[PDB]
Design an enzyme around this catalytic site. Structure first.
Site, PDB file in Angstrom:
ATOM      1  N   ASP B 479       0.834  -1.196   0.000  1.00  0.00           N
ATOM      2  CA  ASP B 479       0.000   0.000   0.000  1.00  0.00           C
ATOM      3  C   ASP B 479       0.876   1.256   0.000  1.00  0.00           C
ATOM      4  O   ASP B 479       2.087   1.171   0.188  1.00  0.00           O
ATOM      5  CB  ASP B 479      -0.944  -0.025   1.211  1.00  0.00           C
ATOM      6  CG  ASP B 479      -2.140   0.919   1.057  1.00  0.00           C
ATOM      7  OD1 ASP B 479      -2.294   1.539  -0.027  1.00  0.00           O
ATOM      8  OD2 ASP B 479      -2.930   1.023   2.028  1.00  0.00           O
ATOM      9  N   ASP B 549     -10.646   2.405  -3.005  1.00  0.00           N
ATOM     10  CA  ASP B 549     -11.152   2.298  -1.642  1.00  0.00           C
ATOM     11  C   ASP B 549     -12.663   2.390  -1.649  1.00  0.00           C
ATOM     12  O   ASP B 549     -13.317   2.097  -0.650  1.00  0.00           O
ATOM     13  CB  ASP B 549     -10.559   3.385  -0.744  1.00  0.00           C
ATOM     14  CG  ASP B 549      -9.174   3.031  -0.251  1.00  0.00           C
ATOM     15  OD1 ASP B 549      -8.869   1.819  -0.274  1.00  0.00           O
ATOM     16  OD2 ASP B 549      -8.399   3.943   0.162  1.00  0.00           O
TER      17      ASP B 549
END
Ligand SMILES: [Pt+2]
Ligand SMILES: [Pt+2]
Ligand SMILES: [Pt+2]
Ligand SMILES: [Pt+2]
Ligand SMILES: [Pt+2]
Ligand SMILES: [Pt+2]
Ligand SMILES: [Pt+2]
Ligand SMILES: [Pt+2]
Ligand SMILES: [Pt+2]
Ligand SMILES: [Pt+2]
Ligand SMILES: [Pt+2]
Ligand SMILES: [Pt+2]
Ligand SMILES: [Pt+2]
Ligand SMILES: [Pt+2]
Ligand SMILES: [Pt+2]
Ligand SMILES: [Pt+2]
Ligand SMILES: [Pt+2]
Ligand SMILES: [Pt+2]
Ligand SMILES: [Pt+2]
Ligand SMILES: [Pt+2]
Ligand SMILES: [Pt+2]
Ligand SMILES: [Pt+2]
Ligand SMILES: [Pt+2]
Lengths: 729, 729, 183, 183
Positions: B479, B549
C-alpha cells in the site's frame, strides 16, 4: 470607500454598485477566494469552505486537522511546495536547489488610486477618488520572500485589476521560475471558456469550449502576444450570449509570452491562472530587489458578452490609452503596401497622392520599402535612413508634397528587426539575437535585435529620431514581422538567460515609450504582420492597430467580430483592398469591402490610380458618407448583433446619448430560396423616436429593439446594407 | 519482415497484417510523421507534406526556402530552439544558459526483439522473431547530444511501442528539463479525446472531450501516476463507440509524474506529447552518460473501444506482467480492513480465519496494524517488525495456523512511508523526505522516505526480508497512502534537486523489483489508497491492484468500467463489502455487491464473524458459483456492453475458443413505468450454438448478438443478473 | 433534379438526392454565371464537375459563349464521354458533405477496375488547413494508376492514406481524378 | 403501406426536406416522445419533403453503423409518421397521406396501396443508398434506356426562355454539333 476589511471573520470586501469581490484569510494564513460577481451590501460567512477529510489532500505543516487542505481550498494564489497539486501561480527556485515556497498572510494596505507599474503598461486614474487599491502581502518566513497581491477596483466600473510584486527580503538570490498576475478559484460553477485563437491572416476567431477535468492552456512562446492565441479568456454560463447571462473576462496587459491556464480539478472546482508564460522564464531576484508582473483586467458582466466587451472598451479607451489622439477622429488614409508593394519610387507615389486628394482622403502612409536599399524583404532592416534612388531629394521633399496636397503623411518602421544584408549588421553583428555558436533560424529572411540591451535600443532610437525630429511625419506604422526563435541576451550571465524573453518586452516597451512620449503629436498605429501583437498592453502606446494582413471583406467579419470581444473599434484599422482578394482569392462587391472596413478605422490599400471611374466615385461616396458617421462608428458603444455562422454578421454603434446609431448588416451566402430574416437593434432608448435617415420613416426605440425590421432579400454573395438612425424631437 | 527503410525516398515503414506506421526524413534532417493506422502494403510518397509559405512559421537555419517549416511540419519529435512553437517534446539547458537544441537525423538501426530499459518496467518478447525495433538517432552537432527514438512493433498486435534514450557525447554536462517518450502529429483529423480522471474513492471515470485550438494537459505532480488522472489517453473519431470506429490509445508505462499533451494548432493539426511530467524535472546528464525514458504503448483500433482495450489487455497480460501468477487463477480472499480496522488480535483473527475456511474462502490477508506499535494511522510506519502485543507467539505462529486451516496467508506493507512516531525516525531522521530547514506537510499524518537513496532502500528491504524469508507469506498487499509534497533528496547537490521525483520512482522500482524477484512465488497486489498507482508500469511488478477504496457496488461500476479501458480485469481486485456502504452510505442488495465484485478478482471485506448463518449461506453460494466461472471471468476476452449513464452497466467475458461466456447486467435506478430493454452479446462465434446453463434453452451466436434478449423487469434499485452460456456439441 | 443550377447549392441537393436515388436517375446541366437563381459567381470548371455527378447537359446560350468557353465545353464533353460509363452507372460513394467546406464523391465500376473521384472546395481561406481525401469501394489488393499523373497506388493506400487535396486560392474550385487498375 | 414497431432502439431520423430550387437537403433529428410527421398535401410527392425516411443509430455515418431506409413507391400525397411512445418504443407508419383521403370500398372490391422499399444496412449510409440504387435501377426502372449511356444534351430553357423562334434555335443546334453534344 470601496474596500473594507472585517477583522472579526478576516474578510476583505471590494465593492461598488455593480460588483463585489470577496477574499478571506483562512487557516494557516491561506489567502482564500470567496466570490466575484454582482455587488452585495454585506457578507456573513455563508461561503466559508466546507471542511472535509479528502483522501490524499494533505494538510498544513505541523497540523493534525486533516479536514483542511491547501489542495482543496479555493485560493487567491498558490505555489509549488505547499501541498497543492493544481498548477501553481508561482514556482520559486531556492539556493538549496529546491522549489519550495510557503506563502502565508502577513499584512494589508489600502491606497487611493492605483500604483504605476515599473517598466510596464497599465491602467491608471485621472482622479484618485475614482479607484482604490487593496494590497495584500504574503511571506515565506524561511526564504524571506514577500508577495504583494494588488487589487484595484474602480468606483464606476464592473472591473477588478490584479497584479503581483515580488520582493526578496533575504540574504541570498532566488529565481522566479513562474509568477502569475492572478489566480482565481471557483466552486460549483459550470463554465464554458471562450478564447480567441487564430493564425497569421486569420486572427481571433471566437472559440467556445466545455471545461473538462484537467488543464486547458492558452499561451504563446513567440515573444509576442501572438496571432495564434490572444491574451484574453472569458468564462461564461452555458446559456450566456451576446445579450444575456454572466461572463467573466480576463485580459492580460502584456505583449510578450502569456499563459492562461484553466483547470477543473478532482472536486469539480475551476482554477484559473494568468500571467507571463513560464516557458524559459527564470528571473534572478537578488536580495533587496523586486519583480513586477503585468496586470490583468477582470470584468464581470451580468447581462451578456456585449456588456462585458463594453466595459473593456471603456476602460481601455479612457484609462489605459495615453495617446493624445485617442479621442480624435482617425484620418481616412491610403496605404501603398498592397497597391505597389516594393515596386515603387517617388513619382509613382506622388500620382497616388494626387488621386488621394481628389478622392477626399486625409493621409498618405508610405509603407515598407523607402529605406536602406529595400527593394524586397531580403535586406536593409536596421538601416533607417532614406533610400536615395527612390527619393533623390530626400524624404522631406516628398513629405512636403503630401502636405501641400492637403494630406497628413505617415511612415512605416520595423524598429525591432535586422537583416544579414544591412549596414547595421555589418557594423554591429552582435546586435542580432542568437545563441552564440549556433546559426539562428531565419523568418521572412530576417532576424531579431537584442532589445534587452540599452545600446541596441539607443542605436535604433537615434536612427529614427534623425527622421522624426523634422515633424514632417504625422503618423507612424510600427511593424514587426516575425516571432523570436533564438532566445539569448549576450550581455547576461548564463544563469540569467531565463530573463531574455521578458527583458526583450521590457526593452520594447521602453523604446516605444521613449518615442511615443517624445512625439505626442504623432499618431502611432501598431502592427505585427497584422494583428500579431494586438493586446491591452500595446493599447497603452498605440491607439490603433492593424487588425490583420487578411483584407478580405468576408474573412475580416469573423476577425473583427472576435477582436471586438475585448478591444474598442477605434483601436482596430480596416482597409478596402482589391478584388479578387490578394490573400484568399475571394470576389466581393466594392460596397461590401467598404462597409466591413467602416467597422474599424477606414483606410484604402489599393492602387487608386488604376481605379475605374465607377470605383473612383464609389470611393468618393464611401469617404464622404464615412465622414458623416465616423464619430459614432469610431467611438460609439459597440453592439454585436449577428455572428457570421448565422450566414449574417451584423453590428452597430450608438452614441453616448442614444441619439444616433449606425447599423451594418452583411449577408454571406445567397440562396435560390431565401429564408426571411429580421434585424433587431440594441442600445437605443425605448422612449425616444428614431428617424431612418435614408427612408425618412420614424420608429420608437422599443420598436427597433423588439420588432426590428426585415432585411432586404438580395441575390448574389457577400452583400452589405447600412442604416443610420437619428433621434428626433 | 516488419520494418523497412527506403533510402531512396527516406521513408521508414513499420507494419504487420494490422497496422502501418510511416515516418520520413524531411528537409534539414527533420523526422516527420506520416501515418499510423490500418496496414498498407506499400507507400509511394502521397503523404509528402504540402509546401506553403505560412506567415510567421520560420525556416531552417541558412535556408532561403520559406515554404518549409518545423513549425508547420508534422513530426516524430521536437525541441525548444528549433523554430517550432508547439509544446516541445524535449527541452535542454546548455552550459551557456540557453535552452537551445536542434535535432537532425543522423542514422538508424533495425533490431530483432526490443531492448530492455534500465531501471524501468517495459514490455518484452518471449521469442525474438515476434518483434522488431527501429531506432532512429537524432543529433545536435553543436552540443553533441544524441537522441535515440525507439519504435517497437510486434508481429501479431496492433501496437507500436515508443521510448527515448538521450546520450551526452560532449565535453560538458547538460540538463534535461524535459524529455517526452513520444510525439505524434496528425493532419486533417477531427478527434475527440478520451481520458480517465477521478479522485480518491472515485477513480477513472471515462471523460470524452472535443479538442479546440490550444493545449489540453492531463497530468500528475504527486510523484505517483495518481487517482486524479490516469496515465492514459485515447484519440477517437466523433462516431467511435465500444464496437465501431477509429481509436488510438496511449498508455504510459510509468508510475510517477506523467504529462499527456493534446494540442490543436493554428493549422488545424493535432500535436500529441507524452512522458515524464517536466514539473520540477531537471536531469543532469554528464558527458558520456545516458537517460532512458519510460516507454509508451500505442494501440490502433479500427473497430471501436472494446477492440482497442482488448489489445491493451492482451499486451499487458502476455508481454509485460512478469509474475508467475499472471496465468493463474486468483484466490477468493478475505481482508480484515473494513471488517475490523486496527481493532484486532491473534485470537480474533483466528475466528475470521475459521469462518473463512467454512465459507470456502481460499486466502486470509492480514491488513494494517500488525507491525510496530500500530494502533492507528498516527505511528509506526517504517517499523516492519511484528507487534508482539498483538501476536504473543510471533507472526510465524499465526501464519502456520492459517496454513493449517487450508488457507494461503497474505500480509499488508507500506514500505515507502515513515511516521515521526517510529523507531525508524528515531534512528534515521534524515530518511524522511523534506526540504532541510522546512517543516514538511503531513498527509494522513505520515511522510515519505527518500527512496532515491540506496541506504534507505536497503534498510526497508532487510526489514522485509526478515519477515518473508521463511516463506510463510503467500501474498503481499503493498500500500501507499499519500502523495509526495516536499520534493528533495538530501544526498544530491543543489543542482540535481530536479532529479528527486524521477529518482524516487526509480528507487521505488529498484526496491519493488528486488522483492518481486526474490519472492517469485508470492502474489503481489499493488495498492495506493485504492488505485492511486494503477498503471502499465505497475503491472510489470504486481499482477493485480486494489482498484479503489470505494467498495460501493454502484460507484464501482463506472470505476471498473473506466479501468477496463486500459487494464485487463484480472489486474483489478474487487471486494464484497458491507451495506450501507462505508464510503457513501448507499444501500445495495448483497447479490449486487457480489455481481459487481466478480468483474474483478473476487474477495471479501466484511466481518465474517458477526455474520448470520442466513447470509453466510449467500457467501457460500457466491464463492461456489464464482469458482464455477472464474477461469472465464478473470481471463476471458472482456467486452463492455453498456455504460452506467444508460441506467444499465453490462459486460461479458468470452474464453479464447468462444465456447464459454459469462454476462453481467446491472440495473441502476428502478422506475414505476419502466422501458423494456434488451441486452445483446458480443465476441461469440456466429455459427456455434450456446446453452443458457440456467434455463437450458439454446441459441445461435448470431441470435445472441443480433437479436439479444429482454432484460427481466424488476422492482427496486441496484439490481443484478448473471448469465452463463456454454457452446454445445 | 432541381431548377437551381448553381454549382454550389446543387452539391447539397445532389448529395441528398443520392441518399436514395441512383445518379443515372438525376440530370444536371452546366448553366450560366452569375447563376440565374441566386446570383453566385462560379468557375466554369466547377459547374462542369458538379454537373458530371448526374447526367451531364448544357443549359445556356452556346452561341453567346467565349472561345475560352467553347473549348472548355469541347474539353468537358470529350472527357465526360471517356468516363460516363463509370460516372453514370458505377457504385456511388459519398466522401464528404458540404458542411465540411468540401463535398466529395466518387464512382467505381462493378469490377473495381475503374474509379472516378471529384472533390469540390466551397470556401477559400487566407490560411488554409491541409485536407486529405480518402477513397472507398476499391480492391485493397489491386494497383491503381492515376491517369493524370501516371503514378500508381494500391487500393489499400488510396483507402487508408488517401492523398492531399491541392491548396488553391479562390472560392468554389473542383478537382477530378480518374484511377484505373493495372496488371 | 406498412407499420414497424421497435423496442429499445435509440434512433435518429433522417429525411430530405427542401423547397423549390432547394430540394432534398439531408436532415437528421432526435426522436422525442410524440409524433414526427413528414408529408405532402400537394398532390405530388413534392419539393418540400421527399417520400423517404431513414432510421439510424446516433453513431451511424456514411461508412459505418446501422441504418433503416424506407422509400414509398408513390408520387402523390405521402405520410411518414415516426412516434416514440410512453414506453420508449418507436412506431413507424408510411403510406398515402390520409389528408382528404376517404375511399369508398364497395362489397367485393379491393384497394391496393403503393408499396414501400425497406433497406437494412449494417455498415453506413453509402451501403444503404447502394441497395436502393441497385434495386431501383435493376428491378423497378423499365425504360429500355435505363442501361444506356445518357446523351450529353443542350436544353434551350435558361438559354432563351420563351424568347426564341426556329432560326434562333438552329444556330444553337449548329453550335451544339461543333461542341460534341448529342441531343
Ligand atoms: Pt443581480
Ligand atoms: Pt436578463
Ligand atoms: Pt442569467
Ligand atoms: Pt455604408
Ligand atoms: Pt447556405
Ligand atoms: Pt460560404
Ligand atoms: Pt434594447
Ligand atoms: Pt427594449
Ligand atoms: Pt422594451
Ligand atoms: Pt481497412
Ligand atoms: Pt468507421
Ligand atoms: Pt430514471
Ligand atoms: Pt458479434
Ligand atoms: Pt454477428
Ligand atoms: Pt451476424
Ligand atoms: Pt452472479
Ligand atoms: Pt472534370
Ligand atoms: Pt471558412
Ligand atoms: Pt475501403
Ligand atoms: Pt481497406
Ligand atoms: Pt485495408
Ligand atoms: Pt464496422
Ligand atoms: Pt456499429
Amino acid at each position: 470607500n470601496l474596500i473594507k476589511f472585517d477583522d472579526q471573520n478576516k474578510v476583505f470586501h471590494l465593492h461598488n454598485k455593480q460588483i463585489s469581490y470577496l477574499l478571506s484569510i483562512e487557516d494557516g494564513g491561506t489567502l482564500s477566494h470567496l466570490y466575484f460577481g454582482g455587488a452585495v451590501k454585506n457578507y456573513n460567512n455563508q461561503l466559508k469552505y466546507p471542511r472535509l477529510d479528502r483522501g490524499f489532500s494533505g494538510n498544513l505543516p505541523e497540523s493534525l486537522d486533516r479536514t483542511f487542505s491547501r489542495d482543496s481550498l479555493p485560493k487567491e494564489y498558490s505555489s509549488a511546495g505547499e501541498m497543492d497539486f493544481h498548477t501553481p501561480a508561482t514556482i520559486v527556485r531556492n539556493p538549496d536547489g529546491s522549489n519550495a515556497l510557503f506563502l502565508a498572510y502577513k499584512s494589508y494596505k489600502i491606497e487611493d488610486g492605483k500604483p504605476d507599474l515599473k517598466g510596464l503598461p497599465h491602467s491608471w486614474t485621472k482622479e484618485d477618488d475614482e479607484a482604490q487599491t487593496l494590497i495584500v502581502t504574503l511571506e515565506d518566513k524561511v526564504s524571506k520572500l514577500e508577495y504583494d497581491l494588488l487589487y484595484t477596483i474602480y468606483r464606476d466600473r464592473p472591473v477588478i485589476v490584479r497584479s503581483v510584486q515580488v520582493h526578496n527580503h533575504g540574504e541570498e538570490a532566488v529565481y522566479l521560475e513562474k509568477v502569475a498576475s492572478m489566480q482565481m478559484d471557483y466552486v460549483d460553477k459550470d463554465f464554458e471558456v471562450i478564447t480567441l485563437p487564430g493564425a497569421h491572416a486569420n486572427e481571433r476567431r471566437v472559440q467556445r469550449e466545455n471545461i473538462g477535468q484537467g488543464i486547458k492552456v492558452f499561451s504563446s512562446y513567440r515573444g509576442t502576444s501572438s496571432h495564434q492565441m490572444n491574451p484574453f479568456m472569458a468564462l461564461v454560463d452555458h446559456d450566456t450570449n451576446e445579450f444575456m447571462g454572466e461572463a467573466y473576462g480576463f485580459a492580460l496587459a502584456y505583449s510578450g509570452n502569456h499563459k492562461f491556464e484553466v483547470e477543473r480539478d478532482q472536486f469539480g472546482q475551476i482554477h484559473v491562472n494568468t500571467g507571463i508564460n513560464d516557458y524559459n522564464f527564470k528571473w534572478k531576484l537578488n536580495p533587496n530587489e523586486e519583480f513586477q508582473t503585468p496586470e490583468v483586467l477582470m470584468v464581470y458582466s451580468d447581462q451578456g458578452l456585449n456588456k462585458m466587451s463594453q466595459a473593456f472598451h471603456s476602460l481601455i479607451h479612457e484609462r489605459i490609452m495615453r495617446s493624445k489622439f485617442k479621442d480624435q477622429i482617425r484620418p481616412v488614409l491610403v496605404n501603398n503596401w498592397e497597391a505597389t508593394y516594393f515596386d515603387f519610387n517617388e513619382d509613382k507615389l506622388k500620382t497616388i497622392v494626387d488621386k488621394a486628394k481628389k478622392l477626399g482622403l486625409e493621409m498618405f502612409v508610405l509603407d515598407d520599402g523607402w529605406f536602406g536599399h529595400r527593394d524586397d524583404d531580403n535586406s536593409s532592416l536596421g538601416d533607417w535612413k532614406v533610400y536615395k534612388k527612390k527619393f533623390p531629394n530626400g524624404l522631406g521633399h516628398f513629405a512636403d508634397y503630401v502636405h501641400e496636397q492637403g494630406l497628413k503623411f505617415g511612415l512605416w518602421f520595423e524598429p525591432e528587426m535586422i537583416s544579414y544584408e544591412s549596414n547595421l549588421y555589418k557594423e554591429h553583428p552582435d546586435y542580432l539575437m542568437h545563441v552564440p555558436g549556433r546559426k539562428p533560424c531565419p523568418s521572412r529572411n530576417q532576424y531579431v535585435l537584442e532589445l534587452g540591451r540599452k545600446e541596441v535600443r539607443d542605436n535604433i532610437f537615434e536612427q529614427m529620431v534623425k527622421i522624426l525630429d523634422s515633424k514632417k511625419i504625422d503618423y507612424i506604422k510600427w511593424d514587426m514581422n516575425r516571432s523570436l526563435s533564438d532566445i539569448y541576451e549576450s550581455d547576461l550571465p548564463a544563469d540569467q538567460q531565463g530573463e531574455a524573453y521578458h527583458r526583450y518586452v521590457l526593452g520594447y516597451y521602453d523604446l516605444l515609450n521613449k518615442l511615443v512620449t517624445r512625439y505626442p503629436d504623432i499618431l502611432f498605429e501598431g502592427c505585427s504582420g497584422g494583428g500579431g501583437r494586438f493586446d491591452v498592453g500595446q493599447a497603452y502606446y498605440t491607439p490603433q492597430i492593424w487588425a490583420s494582413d487578411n483584407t478580405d471583406a468576408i474573412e475580416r467579419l469573423k476577425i473583427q467580430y472576435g477582436t471586438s470581444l475585448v478591444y474598442p473599434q477605434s483601436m482596430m484599422t480596416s482597409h478596402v483592398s482589391v478584388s479578387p482578394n490578394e490573400q484568399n482569392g475571394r470576389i466581393t462587391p466594392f460596397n461590401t469591402r467598404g462597409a466591413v472596413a467602416m467597422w474599424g478605422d477606414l483606410g484604402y490599400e489599393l492602387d487608386l490610380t488604376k481605379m475605374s471611374d465607377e470605383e473612383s466615385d464609389q470611393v468618393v461616396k464611401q469617404v464622404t458618407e464615412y465622414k458623416k458617421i465616423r464619430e459614432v462608428t469610431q467611438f460609439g458603444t459597440l453592439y454585436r448583433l449577428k455572428a457570421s455562422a448565422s450566414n449574417q454578421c451584423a453590428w452597430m454603434m450608438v452614441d453616448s446619448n442614444k441619439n444616433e446609431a449606425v447599423v451594418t448588416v452583411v449577408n454571406v451566402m445567397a440562396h435560390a430560396q431565401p429564408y426571411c430574416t429580421k434585424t433587431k437593434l440594441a442600445g437605443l432608448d425605448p422612449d425616444k423616436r428614431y428617424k431612418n435617415l435614408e427612408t425618412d420613416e420614424v420608429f420608437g426605440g422599443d420598436e427597433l429593439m423588439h420588432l426590428g425590421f426585415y432585411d432586404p432579400i438580395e441575390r448574389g454573395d457577400f452583400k452589405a446594407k447600412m442604416y443610420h438612425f437619428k433621434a428626433i424631437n
